[PDB]
Design a protein around this ligand. Structure first.
Ligand code: NAG
Lengths: 48, 31
């Protein structure tokens, strides 16, 4: 629901959100396989 | 008629919220 909102935040007013009592469902953001931007310098995708 | 109001409460951070379901019996609490 957060990722599929109708209105996107502006550049001057960046919207910052804090997450509590939730889990990192990485597979949902990983099943599309659209990770074109893979400039993950300094980290590894296996130590997650 | 209204008595469930709130005063101030600027709520700067309030990043933790545990909204959850909760002769008289003696209510004993240990905090
Ligand atoms: C809580 O987070 C908000 C985010 O805008 C911040 O402005 C505020 O200073 C924080 N308060 C704390 C750390 O208690």
């Amino acid at each position: 629901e957060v990722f599929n909102a109708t209105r996107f935040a502006s550049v001057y007013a960046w919207n910052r959100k804090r997450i509590s009592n939730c889990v990192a469902d990485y597979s949902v953001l990983y099943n599309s396989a659209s990770f074109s931007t893979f400039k993950c310098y300094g980290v590894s995708p296996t130590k997650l | 008629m209204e008595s469930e109001f709130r005063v101030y409460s600027s709520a700067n951070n309030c990043t933790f919220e545990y909204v959850s379901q909760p002769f008289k019996n003696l209510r004993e609490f240990v905090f």
